[PDB]
Design a protein around this ligand. Structure first.
Ligand code: SF4
Ligand SMILES: [Mg+2]
Ligand SMILES: [Mg+2]
Ligand SMILES: [Mg+2]
Ligand SMILES: [Mg+2]
Ligand SMILES: [Mg+2]
Ligand SMILES: [Mg+2]
Ligand SMILES: [Mg+2]
Ligand SMILES: [Mg+2]
Ligand SMILES: [Mg+2]
Ligand SMILES: [Mg+2]
Ligand SMILES: [Mg+2]
Ligand SMILES: [Mg+2]
Ligand SMILES: [Mg+2]
Ligand SMILES: [Mg+2]
Ligand SMILES: [Mg+2]
Ligand SMILES: [Mg+2]
Ligand SMILES: [Mg+2]
Ligand SMILES: [Mg+2]
Ligand SMILES: [Mg+2]
Ligand SMILES: [Mg+2]
Ligand SMILES: [Mg+2]
Ligand SMILES: [Mg+2]
Ligand SMILES: [Mg+2]
Ligand SMILES: [Mg+2]
Ligand SMILES: [Mg+2]
Ligand SMILES: [Mg+2]
Ligand SMILES: [Mg+2]
Ligand SMILES: [Mg+2]
Ligand SMILES: [Mg+2]
Ligand SMILES: [Mg+2]
Ligand SMILES: [Mg+2]
Ligand SMILES: [Mg+2]
Ligand SMILES: [Mg+2]
Ligand SMILES: [Mg+2]
Ligand SMILES: [Mg+2]
Ligand SMILES: [Mg+2]
Ligand SMILES: [Mg+2]
Ligand SMILES: [Mg+2]
Ligand SMILES: [Mg+2]
Ligand SMILES: [Mg+2]
Ligand SMILES: [Mg+2]
Ligand SMILES: [Mg+2]
Ligand SMILES: [Mg+2]
Ligand SMILES: [Mg+2]
Ligand SMILES: [Mg+2]
Ligand SMILES: [Mg+2]
Ligand SMILES: [Mg+2]
Ligand SMILES: [Mg+2]
Ligand SMILES: [Mg+2]
Ligand SMILES: [Mg+2]
Ligand SMILES: [Mg+2]
Ligand SMILES: [Mg+2]
Ligand SMILES: [Mg+2]
Ligand SMILES: [Mg+2]
Ligand SMILES: [Mg+2]
Ligand SMILES: [Mg+2]
Ligand SMILES: [Mg+2]
Ligand SMILES: [Mg+2]
Ligand SMILES: [Mg+2]
Ligand SMILES: [Mg+2]
Ligand SMILES: [Mg+2]
Ligand SMILES: [Mg+2]
Ligand SMILES: [Mg+2]
Ligand SMILES: [Mg+2]
Ligand SMILES: [Mg+2]
Ligand SMILES: [Mg+2]
Ligand SMILES: [Mg+2]
Ligand SMILES: [Mg+2]
Ligand SMILES: [Mg+2]
Ligand SMILES: [Mg+2]
Ligand SMILES: [Mg+2]
Ligand SMILES: [Mg+2]
Ligand SMILES: [Mg+2]
Ligand SMILES: [Mg+2]
Ligand SMILES: [Mg+2]
Ligand SMILES: [Mg+2]
Ligand SMILES: [Mg+2]
Ligand SMILES: [Mg+2]
Ligand SMILES: [Mg+2]
Ligand SMILES: [Mg+2]
Ligand SMILES: [Mg+2]
Ligand SMILES: [Mg+2]
Ligand SMILES: [Mg+2]
Ligand SMILES: [Mg+2]
Ligand SMILES: [Mg+2]
Ligand SMILES: [Mg+2]
Ligand SMILES: [Mg+2]
Ligand SMILES: [Mg+2]
Ligand SMILES: [Mg+2]
Ligand SMILES: [Mg+2]
Ligand SMILES: [Mg+2]
Ligand SMILES: [Mg+2]
Ligand SMILES: [Mg+2]
Ligand SMILES: [Mg+2]
Ligand SMILES: [Mg+2]
Ligand SMILES: [Mg+2]
Ligand SMILES: [Mg+2]
Ligand SMILES: [Mg+2]
Ligand SMILES: [Mg+2]
Ligand SMILES: [Mg+2]
Ligand SMILES: [Mg+2]
Ligand SMILES: [Mg+2]
Ligand SMILES: [Mg+2]
Ligand SMILES: [Mg+2]
Ligand SMILES: [Mg+2]
Ligand SMILES: [Mg+2]
Ligand SMILES: [Mg+2]
Ligand SMILES: [Mg+2]
Ligand SMILES: [Mg+2]
Ligand SMILES: [Mg+2]
Ligand SMILES: [Mg+2]
Ligand SMILES: [Mg+2]
Ligand SMILES: [Mg+2]
Ligand SMILES: [Mg+2]
Ligand SMILES: [Mg+2]
Lengths: 82, 99, 96, 208, 137, 122
RNA sequence: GCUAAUCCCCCAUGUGGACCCGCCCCUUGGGGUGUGUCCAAAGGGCUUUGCCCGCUUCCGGAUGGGCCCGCGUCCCAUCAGCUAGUUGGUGGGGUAAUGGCCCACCAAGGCGACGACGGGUAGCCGGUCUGAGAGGAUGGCCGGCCACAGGGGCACUGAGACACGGGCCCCACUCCUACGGGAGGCAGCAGUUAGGAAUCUUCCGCAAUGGGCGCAAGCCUGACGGAGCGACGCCGCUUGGAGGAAGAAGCCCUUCGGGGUGUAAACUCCUGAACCCGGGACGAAACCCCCGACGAGGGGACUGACGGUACCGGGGUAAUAGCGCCGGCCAACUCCGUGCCAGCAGCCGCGGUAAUACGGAGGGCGCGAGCGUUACCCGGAUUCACUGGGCGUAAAGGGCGUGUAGGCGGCCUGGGGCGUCCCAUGUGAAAGACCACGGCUCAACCGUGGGGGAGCGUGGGAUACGCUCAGGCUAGACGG
RNA sequence: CCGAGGGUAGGGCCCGUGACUGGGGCGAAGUCGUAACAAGGUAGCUGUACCGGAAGGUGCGGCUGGAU
């Protein structure tokens, strides 16, 4: 199944994720279908999170399944707010 | 789209199959000169209606045999036994290239 | 030294028999319908051909046949039975 | 790390006063005043015509030894300036002067860049309120280099700042004395820094 | 004769090197357009369609600099350098983005485009490439 | 050549013949001495140069120079070798590394100790 | 021998789907419809005439694949001829599906100097190193694709495998054994051994991210997140700062007057790597639970391997420097010792009693936790020359014709628009590279944003040049 | 039926090695003569042929890159 998840980039003790859609059988940091945001768990920048909701809601439409702490961050951007 | 090539029929000694010599040009990727290159395609002639010396068009096609991935699309010109001889003269010269 | 792989193997052997048994029966009745139709005997040919068709689609219910594979056997079966009876005629029952 | 041995021999070798010690650099017991010839057994022998390689090596060793910087860091800065669009000579000197340990010396917090480095390395310096103990920091325009207030009651830094009272700094700088803080205005020019150095000869040394 | 275009450029070069006032090249429309560029840019005084023993020619009128002083009075050439680029044995075509600047602007590259024969400046102002015929300065 | 000849034939890239075949792609090769003797050099030099014939692990037997004043190598001495000829002993293409395996460093050496494999003296 | 089920089977139901034949549309097997024939199923748990987890048939989506095609992809022609499932046809078998993929028959074909066949070498690419560019070299780490899982063959199960830690068989090898017989497959993580010039801990944790299963709690995860060792690479940092004699001693040189090491040391003040004590993270809030409605939304909670680590605060000791080189190229010179010896050497060359070239010393130059050496790649090498070379005597015109293929080709007109040129558009993944900003105190490293390119697909346009087709010409060529 | 492979037989290519043998490169401190460079003491070189301890000689034809 297609999934929306966090491909870790960055470096050691400095994680920087790309909120991303890819086949679940890929490896974590492998070729993704498309990128739809980034995430900085350390909050050390004036926008440690971003989400293209126009696309993030499309992938939910065609049935992508968000990870748990991906949905938690897709929530903080309001993809679910009705 | 399906690839379409033009060339002359150089043999038709096969049942429902003709051999289309196809030519092309391009600049040599280091010495610039425009050079010629040719290649033969085994073409599906399901009506045995194309003849030696005909110039035809072939279109990339669902595989027919082992070496057959092109059917003949349409006739372009007939009676080109001048081109067919250039191909044959060369092949004949090969015997003079042995030991 | 062990695995749930052992479990997976014991199951493949049980499934192996069910698949082979079904395909055995399908093959037999397919040529039986074909052979009957050759000397057709149209009522008896189509009679069996209906039973071959049921076993085919029953095979493609589960993991024994694929849709297109079952559909393919059916086609060539009916194609062979009709064009055999049509050498003498004429088909009593259906189909079709 | 950095060079640590005798520093007067450097000037005496380069044939020019490099102001590397602070106030003895201005006394009459400066070595250049007493023996302005190269160090070692043959210092007083008549020099031979130096090769163009010699000439260019010397100018580069001058500019380098001035900042007491390693050839490694020196060459990386030159290679940074060399890629940068614009004249490489200017940018090179500009990047050199933008080093924290250099600015601290320019502000008169220390008599010598060596002293500045032991100041910076000992955290006795801050940049925009952030304590920074790194000599290599590239100070940018609009910054602010103060004394660590938890060090402002220190003899050496006070006596130094006393002699800076009303003293001019480069145009590209400004020193709030009494408050022990300075400001980096913009990165300086060849005009602002009259260094006893034709920096163009350093471009040529590295093009070989 | 395998290359009339390079033969003409060579007819001009041999003539200018011994300071002849004119030389005759056998005529052709593609040559006229080439000489049309050399006159309009001042590498030649011009030309005229003349006739040598009943054959259609082009008489090209050369121009040189002022007489010089010293040991060598020979005046400086106006066509210092002219050579064929694209040749029968190797065609040379450039796109508009890869047209060259002869002699840092002080020279012309003559092109054959599908808007006719142009200079490197003309071809760049019309946004077209073509066959790089030769270069002059 | 014409442009057509270059389309027909191309330009020949010429490979570089190694001057150290016995190393077989390695920076060094371990070996065992067979003959340890002195050889005289070519004109215009005169000397008794110290050489060892080495039977290598790469499957080669080669002559290698023994640098420095004095050594301790004998038949069955285990040595390491590196590239480098002796302009002046034809056939000698390699050098024994002092201070490795059974090659002792040069005794009393003071300048250039990393070559000649001599520890810093107190 | 007994028994359960979401296990297997049978019957019904046929929304629908499958197949045959007919017809319509279409155009390779795409869609539609008519008769016949054929095919569905599984329940479980709660807060129980309602929910949730499941199950069945069908259409569609999305994602991931299979197959096919154009073009590109190394060395040897001292490999020049190769080919019987070979090349095509018909029919069948087989598959998810095209195909000699497999089989039977029929025909005599297929391929090659534009290099078949054979031999050698190699996983390929994004990229990487170098280079002014062109080019040359390379494909380790990360990303993508491919291939393999001791050597072979094989199928089974399955949506998917001909399956690294699944099965069968053969072989090589090893082990256990009670001697009757059995077992094994680290090119997973560590680790051992062998080989080698040479390459790591039998570490910690699922806290994060990700995967499988589960309604959920949660379980499993040598993926992974981290810690360990190696100067292996890059980056940052220290071994102190200031003052301090016409200038200690020691050592070196000396014309014996003196010169050098050298502000260097001593010494004085000042700072305070390390170490001590106190505090101490970010990475972590979702899943969950409460209200709402199990949604939207709002509340509440558990949880950190790294780690008592970074980092903060307070205290606080002057606290490792080494390596190469100094004839020329190439930056740095003297004394002794040696005397074609011992030795040096990248090339040219040094050494035979006054050696800036050997060996030490003093001094000097260059770098610095590095400095040298060896190996290999690109550069200098326009020294394989496309950019960008040559062949009278330096290496280089075939002994001379004739002529095959090929390469190349005069003047004018028109048609086509193949090359060629322009515009639009799709593709050109991510990382990297590049400019900018930002985050780790800087940097290295890393994050965010920006700019395109060739090349190829498609659409539209141009016609000078080359090409092609047609017509005409006589200056080339050929005949009288 | 096909079939891993095993067996029998006969071919092709490549590598390592071999009594002995052929010449080659280098060494240099030897023995023999002195063929070439001067008209190099018989102008030289050359294809071929025959011959001689050796450099080389001679025949036949060719070249001048031969002094006077
Ligand atoms: S005293 Fe003179 S010689 Fe010594 S460091 Fe100062 S300026 Fe240079
Ligand atoms: Mg076929
Ligand atoms: Mg199980
Ligand atoms: Mg049976
Ligand atoms: Mg099925
Ligand atoms: Mg199956
Ligand atoms: Mg100053
Ligand atoms: Mg610049
Ligand atoms: Mg100033
Ligand atoms: Mg200045
Ligand atoms: Mg350079
Ligand atoms: Mg050119
Ligand atoms: Mg000598
Ligand atoms: Mg050995
Ligand atoms: Mg021993
Ligand atoms: Mg040394
Ligand atoms: Mg030495
Ligand atoms: Mg039923
Ligand atoms: Mg078929
Ligand atoms: Mg399959
Ligand atoms: Mg086949
Ligand atoms: Mg057959
Ligand atoms: Mg036959
Ligand atoms: Mg071809
Ligand atoms: Mg070839
Ligand atoms: Mg191989
Ligand atoms: Mg290999
Ligand atoms: Mg170059
Ligand atoms: Mg490679
Ligand atoms: Mg590698
Ligand atoms: Mg990889
Ligand atoms: Mg295998
Ligand atoms: Mg296997
Ligand atoms: Mg193995
Ligand atoms: Mg096996
Ligand atoms: Mg496989
Ligand atoms: Mg597996
Ligand atoms: Mg395993
Ligand atoms: Mg297996
Ligand atoms: Mg056991
Ligand atoms: Mg046991
Ligand atoms: Mg027993
Ligand atoms: Mg058994
Ligand atoms: Mg085991
Ligand atoms: Mg292992
Ligand atoms: Mg290990
Ligand atoms: Mg070992
Ligand atoms: Mg070993
Ligand atoms: Mg590791
Ligand atoms: Mg986990
Ligand atoms: Mg999880
Ligand atoms: Mg679940
Ligand atoms: Mg449980
Ligand atoms: Mg487990
Ligand atoms: Mg573990
Ligand atoms: Mg790890
Ligand atoms: Mg750490
Ligand atoms: Mg380190
Ligand atoms: Mg003194
Ligand atoms: Mg003294
Ligand atoms: Mg003294
Ligand atoms: Mg001091
Ligand atoms: Mg104190
Ligand atoms: Mg936390
Ligand atoms: Mg909530
Ligand atoms: Mg949990
Ligand atoms: Mg603590
Ligand atoms: Mg403190
Ligand atoms: Mg303190
Ligand atoms: Mg001290
Ligand atoms: Mg050095
Ligand atoms: Mg000398
Ligand atoms: Mg140098
Ligand atoms: Mg010098
Ligand atoms: Mg002696
Ligand atoms: Mg002497
Ligand atoms: Mg001496
Ligand atoms: Mg030397
Ligand atoms: Mg010496
Ligand atoms: Mg460092
Ligand atoms: Mg190194
Ligand atoms: Mg090189
Ligand atoms: Mg080159
Ligand atoms: Mg060239
Ligand atoms: Mg040359
Ligand atoms: Mg010659
Ligand atoms: Mg000739
Ligand atoms: Mg001949
Ligand atoms: Mg033409
Ligand atoms: Mg032509
Ligand atoms: Mg036209
Ligand atoms: Mg035309
Ligand atoms: Mg066109
Ligand atoms: Mg494009
Ligand atoms: Mg990209
Ligand atoms: Mg920053
Ligand atoms: Mg980026
Ligand atoms: Mg670019
Ligand atoms: Mg187009
Ligand atoms: Mg015509
Ligand atoms: Mg004529
Ligand atoms: Mg005539
Ligand atoms: Mg067999
Ligand atoms: Mg066999
Ligand atoms: Mg067997
Ligand atoms: Mg012999
Ligand atoms: Mg003679
Ligand atoms: Mg003589
Ligand atoms: Mg003579
Ligand atoms: Mg003769
Ligand atoms: Mg004889
Ligand atoms: Mg005799
Ligand atoms: Mg005789
Ligand atoms: Mg003669
Ligand atoms: Mg003659
Ligand atoms: Mg002469």
């Amino acid at each position: 199944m297609v999934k929306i998840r966090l491909a870790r980039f960055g470096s050691k003790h400095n994680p920087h994720y790309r909120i991303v859609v890819t086949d679940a059988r890929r490896k974590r940091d492998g070729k993704y279908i498309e990128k739809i945001g980034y995430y900085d768990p350390r909050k050390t920048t004036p926008d440690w999170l971003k989400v293209d909701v126009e696309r993030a809601r499309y992938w939910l439409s065609v049935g992508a399944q968000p990870t748990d702490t991906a949905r938690r961050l897709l929530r903080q951007a309001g993809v679910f707010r009705q | 789209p399906k690839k379409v090539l033009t060339g002359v029929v150089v043999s038709d000694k096969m049942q429902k199959t003709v051999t289309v010599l196809v030519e092309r040009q391009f600049p040599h990727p280091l010495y610039g000169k425009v050079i010629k290159r040719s290649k033969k395609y085994l073409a599906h002639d399901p009506e045995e209606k194309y003849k030696l010396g005909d110039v035809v068009e072939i279109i990339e096609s669902r595989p027919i045999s082992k070496r057959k991935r092109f059917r003949v699309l349409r006739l372009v010109e007939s009676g080109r036994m001048d081109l067919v001889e250039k191909y044959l003269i060369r092949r004949q010269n090969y015997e003079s290239l042995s030991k | 030294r062990n695995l749930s792989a052992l479990k997976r193997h014991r199951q493949s052997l049980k499934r192996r028999l069910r698949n082979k048994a079904k395909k055995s029966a399908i093959k037999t009745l397919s040529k039986k319908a074909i052979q009957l139709a050759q000397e057709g005997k149209a009522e008896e040919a189509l009679k069996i051909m209906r039973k071959a068709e049921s076993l085919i689609d029953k095979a493609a219910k589960g993991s024994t046949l694929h849709k297109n594979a079952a559909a393919r056997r059916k086609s060539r079966l009916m194609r062979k039975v009709r064009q055999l009876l049509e050498a003498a005629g004429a088909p009593l029952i259906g189909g079709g | 790390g950095r060079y640590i041995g005798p520093v007067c021999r450097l000037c005496r070798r380069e044939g020019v006063k490099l102001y590397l010690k602070g106030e003895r650099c201005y006394s009459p017991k400066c070595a250049m005043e007493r023996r302005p010839y190269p160090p070692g057994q043959h210092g007083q022998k008549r020099a031979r015509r130096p090769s163009d390689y010699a000439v260019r090596l010397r100018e580069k060793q001058k500019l380098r030894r001035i900042y007491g910087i390693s050839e490694r860091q020196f060459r990386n800065l030159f290679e940074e300036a060399s890629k940068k669009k614009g004249v490489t000579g200017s940018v090179f000197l500009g990047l050199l002067e933008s080093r924290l340990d250099n600015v601290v010396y320019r502000l008169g917090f220390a008599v010598s860049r060596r002293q500045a480095r032991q100041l910076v390395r000992h955290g006795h310096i801050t940049v925009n309120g952030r304590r920074v103990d790194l000599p290599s920091y590239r100070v940018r325009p609009g910054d602010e280099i103060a004394v660590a207030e938890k060090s402002r009651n220190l003899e050496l830094i006070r006596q130094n700042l006393e002699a800076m009272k009303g003293r001019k700094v480069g145009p590209w700088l400004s020193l709030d004395v009494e408050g022990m803080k300075g400001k980096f205005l913009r990165l300086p020019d060849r005009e602002d820094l009259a260094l006893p150095v034709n920096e163009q000869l350093v471009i040529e040394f590295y093009s070989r | 004769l395998t290359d009339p275009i390079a033969d003409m450029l060579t007819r001009i070069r041999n003539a200018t090197r011994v300071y002849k006032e004119s030389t005759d090249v056998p005529a052709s429309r593609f040559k006229e357009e080439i000489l049309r560029i050399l006159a309009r840019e001042g590498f030649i005084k011009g030309y005229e369609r003349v006739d040598v023993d009943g054959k259609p020619y082009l008489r090209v009128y050369l121009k040189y600099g002022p007489r010089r002083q010293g040991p060598d009075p020979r005046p400086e050439q106006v066509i210092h350098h002219i050579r064929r680029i694209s040749k029968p044995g190797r065609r040379v075509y450039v796109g508009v983005k890869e047209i060259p600047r002869v002699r840092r602007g002080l020279g012309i590259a003559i092109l054959s485009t599908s808007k006719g024969v142009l200079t490197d400046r003309e071809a760049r102002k019309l946004g077209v490439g073509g066959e790089l015929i030769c270069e002059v300065w | 050549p014409t442009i057509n000849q270059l389309v027909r034939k191309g330009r020949e890239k010429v490979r570089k013949k190694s001057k150290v075949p016995a190393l077989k792609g390695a920076p060094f090769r371990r070996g065992v001495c067979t003959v340890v003797r002195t050889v005289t050099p070519k004109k215009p030099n005169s000397a008794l140069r110290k050489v060892a014939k080495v039977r290598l692990t790469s499957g080669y037997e080669v002559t290698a120079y023994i640098p420095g004043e004095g050594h301790n190598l004998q038949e069955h001495s285990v040595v390491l070798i590196r590239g480098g000829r002796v302009k002046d002993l034809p056939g000698v293409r390699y050098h024994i590394v002092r201070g490795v395996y059974d090659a002792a460093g040069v005794k009393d050496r003071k300048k250039s100790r990393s070559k000649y494999g001599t520890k810093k003296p107190k």
